Design a protein around this ligand. Structure first.
Ligand SMILES: CCCCCCCCCCCCCCCCCC(=O)OC[C@H](COP(=O)([O-])OCC(O)COP(=O)([O-])OC[C@@H](COC(=O)CCCCCCCCCCCCCCCCC)OC(=O)CCCCCCCCCCCCCCCCC)OC(=O)CCCCCCCCCCCCCCCCC
Ligand SMILES: CCCCCCCCCCCCCCCCCC(=O)OC[C@H](COP(=O)([O-])OCC[N+](C)(C)C)OC(=O)CCCCCCCCCCCCCCCCC
Ligand SMILES: NC(=O)C1=CN([C@@H]2O[C@H](COP(=O)(O)OP(=O)(O)OC[C@H]3O[C@@H](n4cnc5c(N)ncnc54)[C@H](OP(=O)(O)O)[C@@H]3O)[C@@H](O)[C@H]2O)C=CC1
Ligand SMILES: CCCCCCCCCCC[C@H](O)CC(=O)SCCNC(=O)CCNC(=O)[C@H](O)C(C)(C)COP(=O)(O)O
Ligand code: SF4
Ligand code: SF4
Ligand code: SF4
Ligand code: SF4
Ligand code: SF4
Ligand SMILES: [K+]
Ligand SMILES: [Zn+2]
Lengths: 176, 238, 209, 55, 45, 48, 342, 60, 145, 96, 155, 42, 115
């Protein structure tokens, strides 16, 4: 099924030629273009008053990363290195070691936020929902080094955006 | 989102309603765009009879997508070689006549309108079921099962660390991309990584022909004959 | 259906492709060495390098082939072979609604007759093949680098060319000009050997030597 | 921030169509952002018997 | 309970138009010229 | 949050901090792991 | 060496050089180059600054991430100097000013500030302090710049014994205020050479040569306590040197002879400007004064470096000053001027 | 007279970088080839990988 | 193997055993392949690893608490197909897909056993035995490992 | 809690703290050394040891799908307690 | 007081600077598409005084949006050196920041920093058009805290 | 069996000058040809 | 096995012939190239750098190979003639910014484990 987009032949009767001539001299399609720009002038602009009116997002939004912890308080990451193994840009570096108490966690968990592609593959691979991408997207910085997060900064994010990340996965865990 | 074996996760509840709401008024917005340019004397003079290519010239130069459609060649992978469920949706391909910039721009606008019918059919015929192939060795298991059963955990572990080994072979698939015939010549070797992923660029052959279409036209028309080219510069350069 | 996950297989297309494969093989036995139809109904024609031009011309012009569109022209670098490069042609026939694959072989120092005469689309594809891999093509109009930066050394897509390259770039203030230096990665690319030591597909079990 | 009828008549006439029917701004017809939890289905192979992977 | 996923309404979504809706407005060719000439005649007088 | 406040846990901060970039409260990346090679400590005994 | 200071790599940006420099006043002519040379080898340079952070932006893209650290310091504050030099291996002094600011005269910035830097560095426990002073440093020269420099280097020597002292003759480079200063004198009618500049003898030294000289001094183990003197290979008479500048710049030459006392007056007239002064009386004395040869002090060559003649790197500075009529002229069109025996 | 379009000003080594990654890891690359055709690019790659795997996605 | 499980029951758990400061013993993961038992009684010569009890409750270990100590003790880590027996010194410090394996020759003893030194990020985690069929067969000494 | 170093710097839970003679410290001057205070090593200790009258238990960290994968701990050795590897919660048979 | 007079005068200049930033679009990759959405009426970059203007002789800030390929690296430096220089550089996306996805390629420089000095860094892949608006807002704050006149008065 | 202006090219293939490798990485590097041993864990 | 079809040259004699005028085409425009690109370096060090690059590729004793560098040098000449390479690309041949790597064994032993 195809349609011929431009195969219209104008009529040669005395009426049609005059209308085309009237269109030519008395610019009409130009007025129609003008007339519609006036229509948009009186309409309702769609601009949102940033930062007083932030844009609409979804619970699945991928932003700044953070390591969450169990309700008890102990971290969720058990250093399985799934997130590091599946990271498409190799932005994850992990070093683990037996903790003093037994059950062992990472001693180094660095995310290179200038090498990250924010694909979210880390939060899917994680079998304990430890590493997640938080809702924040306003962590722009003045220096390149401030982007290169390590375990401490990421753990701080987990203790800062927990009130929001907990609700997001609460609304989205059933889909996954 | 689109991944081998289906999609990542199902649609959030209430998304189809918003898609219907947006598509309802998009016909008007298309008329808003095309009314100020299609009949506009300035617009046609800036595009009509500019960048005209022939039929056999377009075929030989590797042109695909709109460029064949815009110059009489009735070709569209969505109809000739239907992939996915494109054999069930009905739509009209806007074959062009003159082949210049103006005809192709009209084909683009008509292809915009035709997608709405395809959107309408997809919204009204969306079936129930899963969103990934029910096979853990290719698509990762559900998170509920990964925390419950042995096999799901092992498959999730191996799939996100090593991946799914694919049979050793070479293939060349192509789809009617919104610019052309985007395709990949994927060569495997039986491992969990590709051996060679050549990426067919619809704009590569398109940009290769820019010299042919620019022959004789004034320099100020060079922007017009790359505008109808639709060369996104992450595909040609890859 | 009993195969809700397995991709359905078409035998009619397999028979039509196989019949055409024998047809092309008999037409030009001078270059066609072997021909095969893959499991997912795709035809590959293995020609001798000298037959690059004659075979393509036949597929382009014959009334029963009419393959009149070079989809892409690429090569696969396989160092373990005597002719490491393996030039691959992909053609599409609009009249007959089919695609064909024509593949040759070439070592490092051997020129291939440029297909610019038959398919003018090959012109830019030829430059990429030379730039990425180093395969020179004779009779090419404007054979030169297309993708790599000016004065680039080596051919990147070669398997023996390191991924990070040999040279990085930096703005040096002493000369007030962007300069080139030997590469020094802040973090080395952690290579991952993730090939399971257990056989995957018994169908492709290469017989022992 | 739905405007006065005087503007609506002028805005409609200037464009040549009824714009109040289909508008570019979503007021309330959008789906609520707090939706009830879903119940995803299962794949065809989610069977307790006669579901051997070799087949 | 039963399966619950995003689905179209039971009767399906309403129609979604796609064709061109360019209207025809303004007087015919002769009328535009007549009022243009008539203004000149009054202006001349 | 007035109608539905989020669940409360100990580790959650009690005072939100804005972008601390620029101000002398930034985040300075640093190694979170200890040393690897222990240098041999020479004997302070005057030997002989 | 500390466990974290052992050199590593191949001298590139990511290579660990092993020197923690503290280049003072790096937001300037030599400060730009010395940071760059330290930046290439991968040295954590603690650059203190008192100017606007924007004026230090050009310094940022010269080292790997985390290498170049910017700190705020004030000249008349021991605490600021201590803060910047507390963790350092080498401290480089480059504070200087060709004019006397309202809050800072030649005494303040060439003796007082170097005194505080040297004294605090010894208390901190740094290894090497590289202090820079003019080659023409003298206690009796009327130009307070040379007079202050001579007092400062003696004082720095007292406070820091094993402090290498550099005595460059006159740097020339992209922004040198030496070749640019003479080239900029076209606006003021003709060039008013003092006594036609037939007696002043100068030995300009390339800026890059000085920069690599400082870096070689850092790595050299014998630089402890020495007092180097950096001079160019050739030695030029003032009139012929200005001839080479204007010939390379292809500008008209008007050798105006002007009495010394009158020149001191016009230097006073240009001194009144609150902004960056075009020239001061002390500047007039300096260009009038010659560069005495000091063979006893070790030269530039002793720091494993070869000097670069001005006639080799002349178009670098004066290509900008050329108009469109001479913006594309070659390098060898103008031959070197008269070379008085060195 | 002639139009020589010098390209390569954004020659990111995508085709070489794909080799070193897994099939799932190479998925985001196709979203970053054409900045505007996102699902269309992934659809082509998904079809290619599914065709080699002899596996079809569910109707939904 | 299949791609799912149809086992809607409660799994079993087995108390851990201690056999020395060298061998990680998580006996819940064991599959009772008796590879460790066979190795101890054949290649090591000491008979302290065995199987106690019958049925699904059968557990492989040493009954009375006793360290399995021999110059070839660490080899039971390699033969064990699961993570039931692993190495305490290296325990959960790296992952197999991220280490680079470099062949070398052990120098601790005069046998000159061939080993595969695994290095990641310029560090040494594991010394795995290689195969030579003449010098060290498929084993190394504990002092080597 | 957090222990300060003799040089006057907070020590992270991993035990990281720069030496007095370490040059890589100037970064922290005029900035702050990011360290978390909720030391997970400590906080897990305050969790009471649950007592259940069964030889084995099943721990999933609570929340079902929101917790760690379900594991079964063998609370047979009366000498000590059984702790889940993923989360660290302890369990103990009350005098068996 | 002289310090007070220089204080108000500096604020007047800094207000005139931050209230008129004219980006010189270096649209390179998919990071540029999201930036145009900032120019789209949803966020309306123009409303903040910041409006897109070509001809780097008539622009104040660079917005590096996309990967920086080694072949074009001289072009980035040249168009940076030609700006009348109260000037700042905004890096959009992981690729422009430090290489991002193509950090390990043979022909992508690991960050736009190695060519030009970089002001505020905008992380993302791509950073959403709202995130860039926050970035430009951060530069306005940075311009607000400029003491150019105070430093001159205390030189 | 191919008359294509065939000439005697006895000398060994020396494509090194074309691969673009710098001088350092072409002599001082000692490559190793080996069949990798099985991961003893597996 | 010992015989393979050539690129352009049938033996070393004509291959050497194609090198000579390539060197000719490289000698003539060096002052023109220096003028065109505002080279800081004088003409003289331009000419021998062409000579030195031609000199380092001397051990080649294969007609097919010599053709490959001959055509590759032609593109390099083409890139330089029609201002396709800028100053930075030209200055790339003069390795200026990088420090001289010493060649004596003693210095290498002092700096690192480089063989
Ligand atoms: C020709 C212009 C004539 C004067 C303006 C008339 C006008 O447009 O009034 C608005 C009014 C409604 O406009 P609308 O866009 O339909 O309003 C939509 C919402 O109701 C809008 O909802 P809203 O809540 O945004 O409306 C509140 C709005 C309402 O604002 C007004 O009504 C402004 C105009 C009156 C003051 O007031 C404000 O927002 C407060 C700030 C006002 C800004 C400064 C206004 C300056 C006016 C001119 C001063 C002299 C020059 O216009 C009309 O009804 C038509 C007037 C036709 C006049 C023809 C004269 C010949
Ligand atoms: C109508 C406009 C009313 C307000 C105008 C205020 C003056 C603005 C002039 C431009 C900025 C420079 C200035 O004020 O002083 C120049 C002064 C000149 O002395 P300076 O030494 O501070 O200059 C900057 C630093 N160097 C020289 C290294 C580039 O500079 C500054 O104030 C900038 C700091
Ligand atoms: N021919 C020559 O000029 C020679 C010069 N030298 C010495 O080299 C040094 C640097 O010269 P050059 O780079 O050309 O000089 P510039 O004037 O170009 O730069 C001087 C540097 O010192 C800083 N500075 C100066 N005075 C003060 C002060 N009172 N408080 C804080 N910082 C201050 C400047 O900061 P800011 O930029 O903010 O003003 C800037 O960083 C000087 O000691 C000079 O005497 C040695 C031999 C020859
Ligand atoms: C202007 C700015 C950039 C400026 C810098 C520009 C630098 C690059 C310029 C282009 C260089 C070019 O690629 C070089 C090439 O192709 S090939 C070199 C010669 N190699 C051969 O020909 C192989 C065989 N060798 C011989 O034949 C003998 O060695 C000899 C040549 C001595 C003749 O011997 P006879 O006498 O026996
Ligand atoms: S989202 Fe970022 S950190 Fe996570 S896997 Fe993707 S690239 Fe890696
Ligand atoms: S995937 Fe989760 S549990 Fe595994 S290492 Fe990463 S953060 Fe830790
Ligand atoms: S070798 Fe391992 S799996 Fe086998 S019986 Fe011994 S402990 Fe169990
Ligand atoms: S990796 Fe193997 S041994 Fe370890 S838990 Fe998984 S199945 Fe058990
Ligand atoms: S950071 Fe991401 S979005 Fe931006 S240019 Fe790179 S790949 Fe594209
Ligand atoms: K094991
Ligand atoms: Zn638990």
């Amino acid at each position: 099924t195809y349609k011929f987009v431009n195969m219209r032949e104008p009529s040669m009767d005395m009426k049609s030629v005059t209308d085309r001539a009237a269109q030519t001299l008395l610019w009409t399609e130009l007025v129609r273009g003008l007339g519609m720009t006036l229509s948009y002038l009186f309409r309702e602009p769609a601009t949102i008053n940033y930062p007083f009116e932030k844009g609409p997002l979804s619970p699945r939004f991928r932003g700044e990363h953070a390591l969450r912890r169990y309700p008890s308080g102990e971290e969720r990451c058990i250093a399985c290195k799934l997130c590091e193994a599946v990271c498409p840009a190799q932005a994850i570096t992990i070093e683990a070691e037996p903790r003093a108490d037994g059950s062992r966690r990472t001693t180094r968990y660095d995310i290179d936020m200038t090498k990250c592609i924010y694909c979210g593959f880390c939060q899917e691979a994680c079998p304990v929902d430890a590493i997640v991408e938080g809702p924040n997207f306003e962590f722009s910085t003045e220096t390149h080094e401030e982007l290169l997060y390590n375990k401490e900064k990421l753990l701080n994010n987990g203790d800062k955006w927990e009130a929001e990340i907990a609700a997001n996965i609460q609304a989205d865990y059933l889909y996954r | 989102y689109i991944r081998p074996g289906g999609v990542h996760q199902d649609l959030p509840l209430g998304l189809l309603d918003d898609i219907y709401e947006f598509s309802k008024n998009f016909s008007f917005r298309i008329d808003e765009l095309e009314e100020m340019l299609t009949n506009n004397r300035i617009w046609r003079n800036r595009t009509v009879d500019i960048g005209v290519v022939t039929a056999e010239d377009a075929l030989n130069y590797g042109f695909s997508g709109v460029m064949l459609r815009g110059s009489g060649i009735q070709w569209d992978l969505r109809k000739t070689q239907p992939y996915d469920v494109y054999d069930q949706v009905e739509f009209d391909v806007p074959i062009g006549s003159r082949g210049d910039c103006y005809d192709r721009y009209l084909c683009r606008v008509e292809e915009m309108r035709q997608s709405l019918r395809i959107i309408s059919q997809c919204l009204n015929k969306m079936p129930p079921g899963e969103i990934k192939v029910d096979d853990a060795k290719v698509s990762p298991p559900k998170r509920a099962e990964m925390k419950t059963s042995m096999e799901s955990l092992i498959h999730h572990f191996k799939l996100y660390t090593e991946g799914y080994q694919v049979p050793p072979g070479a293939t060349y698939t192509a789809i009617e991309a919104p610019k052309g015939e985007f395709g990949v010549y994927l060569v495997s070797d039986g491992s969990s990584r590709p051996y060679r992923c050549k990426i067919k660029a619809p704009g590569f052959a398109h940009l290769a022909g820019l010299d042919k279409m620019s022959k004789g036209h004034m320099l100020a028309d060079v922007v017009a004959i790359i505008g109808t080219q639709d060369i996104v510069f992450g595909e040609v350069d890859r | 259906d009993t195969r809700p996950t397995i991709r359905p297989r078409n035998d009619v297309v397999h028979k039509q492709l196989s019949a055409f494969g024998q047809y092309v093989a008999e037409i030009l036995p001078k270059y066609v060495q072997q021909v095969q139809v893959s499991c997912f109904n795709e035809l590959e024609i293995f020609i001798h390098p000298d037959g690059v031009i004659p075979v393509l011309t036949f597929l382009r012009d014959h009334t029963n082939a009419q393959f009149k569109s070079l989809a892409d022209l690429t090569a696969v670098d396989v160092p373990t072979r005597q002719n490491r490069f393996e030039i691959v042609y992909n053609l599409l026939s609009l009249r007959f609604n089919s695609q064909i694959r024509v593949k040759t072989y070439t070592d490092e120092l051997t020129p291939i007759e440029s297909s610019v005469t038959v398919y003018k689309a090959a012109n830019w594809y030829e430059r990429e093949i030379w730039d990425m891999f180093g395969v020179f093509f004779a009779n090419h109009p404007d054979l030169r680098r297309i993708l790599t930066g000016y004065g680039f050394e080596g051919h990147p897509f070669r398997k023996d060319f390191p991924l990070s390259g040999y040279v990085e770039l930096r703005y040096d203030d002493e000369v007030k000009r962007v300069v080139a230096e030997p590469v020094e990665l802040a973090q080395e690319f952690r290579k991952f050997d993730l090939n399971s030591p257990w056989e995957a597909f018994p169908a492709y079990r290469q017989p022992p030597e | 921030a739905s405007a006065t009828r005087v503007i609506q008549l002028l805005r409609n006439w200037a464009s040549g169509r009824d714009l109040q029917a289909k508008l570019q701004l979503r007021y309330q017809e959008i789906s609520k952002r707090t939706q009830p939890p879903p119940k995803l289905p299962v794949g065809p192979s989610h069977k307790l018997s006669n579901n051997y992977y070799c087949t | 309970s039963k399966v619950k996923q995003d689905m179209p309404p039971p009767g399906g979504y309403g129609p979604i138009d796609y064709k061109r809706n360019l209207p025809r407005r303004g007087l015919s060719g002769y009328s535009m010229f007549a009022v243009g000439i008539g203004t000149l005649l009054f202006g001349y007088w | 949050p007035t109608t539905k406040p989020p669940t409360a846990r100990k580790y959650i901060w009690t005072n939100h901090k804005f972008n601390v970039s620029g101000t002398p409260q930034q985040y300075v990346p640093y190694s979170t792991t200890r040393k690897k090679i222990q240098e041999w400590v020479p004997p302070s005994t005057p030997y002989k | 060496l500390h466990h974290a200071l052992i050199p590593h790599g191949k001298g590139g940006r990511s290579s660990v050089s092993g020197i923690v420099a503290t280049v003072f006043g790096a937001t300037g002519f030599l400060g730009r180059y010395v940071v760059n040379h330290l930046g290439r080898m991968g040295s954590q340079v603690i650059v203190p600054y008192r100017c606007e952070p924007y004026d230090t932006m050009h310094l940022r893209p010269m080292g790997d991430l985390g290498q170049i650290i910017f700190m705020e310091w004030n000249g008349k504050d021991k605490d600021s100097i201590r803060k910047v030099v507390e963790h350092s291996n080498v401290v480089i002094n480059l504070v200087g000013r060709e004019w006397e600011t309202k809050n800072f005269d030649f005494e303040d910035v060439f003796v007082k500030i170097p005194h505080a830097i040297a004294q605090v560095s010894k208390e901190a426990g740094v290894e090497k302090l590289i202090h820079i002073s003019h080659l023409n440093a003298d206690i009796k020269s009327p130009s307070r710049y040379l007079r202050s420099k001579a007092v400062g280097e003696k004082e720095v020597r007292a406070a820091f014994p094993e402090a290498t002292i550099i005595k460059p003759s006159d740097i020339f480079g992209r922004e040198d205020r030496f070749l640019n200063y003479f080239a900029s004198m076209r606006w003021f009618g003709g060039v008013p050479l003092i006594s036609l500049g037939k007696e002043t003898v100068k030995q300009p030294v390339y800026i890059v040569d000085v920069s690599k000289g400082i870096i070689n001094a850092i790595k050299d183990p014998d630089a402890k306590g020495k007092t180097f003197a950096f001079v160019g290979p050739n030695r030029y008479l003032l009139f012929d040197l200005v001839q080479y500048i204007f010939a390379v710049a292809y500008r008209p030459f008007l050798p105006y002879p002007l009495p010394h006392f009158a020149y001191r007056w016009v230097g006073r007239l240009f001194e009144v400007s609150p902004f960056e002064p075009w020239t001061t009386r002390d500047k007039v004395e300096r260009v009038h004064m010659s560069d005495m040869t000091l063979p006893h002090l070790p030269g530039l060559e002793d720091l494993g470096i070869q000097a670069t003649p001005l006639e080799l790197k002349a178009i670098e500075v004066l290509r900008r000053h050329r108009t469109y009529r001479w913006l594309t002229s070659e390098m060898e069109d103008v031959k070197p001027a008269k070379t008085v025996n060195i | 007279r002639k139009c020589d379009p010098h390209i390569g000003l954004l020659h990111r080594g995508t085709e070489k970088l794909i080799e070193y990654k897994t099939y799932l890891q190479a998925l985001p690359y196709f979203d970053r080839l054409d900045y505007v055709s996102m699902m269309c690019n992934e659809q082509a790659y998904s079809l290619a990988v599914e065709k080699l795997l002899n596996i079809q996605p569910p109707p939904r | 193997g299949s791609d799912r499980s149809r086992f809607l029951e409660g799994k079993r758990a087995v108390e851990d055993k201690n056999i020395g400061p060298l061998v990680k013993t998580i006996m819940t993961r064991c599959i009772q392949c008796t590879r460790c038992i066979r190795f101890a009684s054949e290649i090591a010569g000491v008979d302290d690893l065995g199987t106690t009890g019958r049925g699904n409750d059968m557990q492989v270990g040493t009954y009375i608490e006793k360290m399995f100590m021999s110059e070839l003790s660490g080899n039971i880590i390699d033969i064990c197909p699961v993570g039931a027996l692993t190495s305490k010194p290296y325990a959960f410090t790296a992952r197999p897909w991220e280490t680079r394996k470099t062949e070398s020759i052990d120098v601790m003893d005069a046998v000159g056993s061939n080993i595969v030194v695994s290095t990641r990020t310029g560090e040494v985690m594991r010394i795995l035995p290689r195969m030579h069929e003449d010098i060290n067969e498929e084993w190394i000494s504990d002092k080597t490992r | 809690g957090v222990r300060t170093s003799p040089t006057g710097e907070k020590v992270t839970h991993t035990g990281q703290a720069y030496d007095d003679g370490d040059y890589r410290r100037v970064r922290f001057s005029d900035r702050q050394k990011e360290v978390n205070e909720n030391f997970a090593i400590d906080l897990i200790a305050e969790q009471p040891v649950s007592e259940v009258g069964s030889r084995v238990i099943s721990c999933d960290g609570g929340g079902g799908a929101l917790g760690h994968p379900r594991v079964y701990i063998n609370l047979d050795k009366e000498t000590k307690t059984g702790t889940c590897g993923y989360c660290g919660l302890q369990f103990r048979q009350p005098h068996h | 007081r002289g310090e007070y007079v220089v204080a108000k005068l500096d604020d007047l200049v800094n207000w005139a600077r931050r209230s008129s930033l004219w980006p010189m679009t270096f649209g390179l990759a998919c990071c540029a598409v999201e930036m145009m959405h900032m120019a789209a009426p949803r966020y309306d970059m123009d409303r903040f005084g910041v409006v897109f203007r070509a001809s780097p002789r008539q622009s104040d800030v660079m917005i590096v949006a996309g990967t920086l390929t080694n072949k074009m690296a001289p072009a980035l430096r040249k168009v940076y050196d030609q700006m009348p220089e109260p000037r700042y550089v905004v890096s959009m996306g992981s690729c422009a920041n430090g290489g991002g996805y193509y950090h390990y390629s043979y022909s992508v420089v690991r960050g736009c920093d190695r060519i030009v000095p970089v002001d505020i860094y905008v992380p993302g892949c791509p950073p959403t058009a709202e995130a860039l608006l926050y970035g430009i807002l951060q530069l306005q704050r940075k311009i607000k805290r400029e003491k150019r006149l105070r430093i001159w008065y205390r030189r | 069996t191919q008359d294509t202006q065939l000439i005697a090219v006895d000398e060994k293939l020396d494509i090194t000058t074309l691969t673009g490798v710098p001088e350092e990485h072409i002599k001082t590097r000692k490559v190793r040809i080996f069949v990798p041993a099985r991961n003893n864990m597996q | 096995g010992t015989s393979v079809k050539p690129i352009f040259s049938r033996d070393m004699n004509e291959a050497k012939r194609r090198v000579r005028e390539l060197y000719r085409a490289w000698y003539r425009e060096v002052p023109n190239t220096v003028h065109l690109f505002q080279l800081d370096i004088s003409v003289k060090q331009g000419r021998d750098k062409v000579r030195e690059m031609f000199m380092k590729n001397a051990h080649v004793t294969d007609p097919r190979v010599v053709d490959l560098l001959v055509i590759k040098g032609k593109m390099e000449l083409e890139e330089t003639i029609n201002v396709w390479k800028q100053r930075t690309h030209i200055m790339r041949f003069f390795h200026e910014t990088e420090a001289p790597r010493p060649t004596d064994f003693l210095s290498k032993f002092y700096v690192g484990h480089d063989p």
